[PDB]
Amino acid sequence: FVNQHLCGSHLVEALYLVCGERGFFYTPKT
Amino acid sequence: GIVEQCCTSICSLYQLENYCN
Structure with missing residues (x-):
């Protein structure tokens, strides 16, 4: 719960x- | 790439450093 993957904005x-x-x-591209 | 990995794969803090000018 320290390290989670943040997706989207x-x-x-x-x-x-x-x-x-x-x-x-x-x-978002490169 | 470095930005795209954080979602499905992993982000690195020193890479966070890298995103930051």
Whole structure:
């Protein structure tokens, strides 16, 4: 329950969650 | 790819680092 696979929009989430100020660029194709 | 795996396969935190500029 620490590590689950986030699918759909919420995949972007685990990043912005860890991302913070550095932020991320999400890529659905590549 | 790195983004697509997290759903059916697994995401890596250091890859989370990678998604992040």
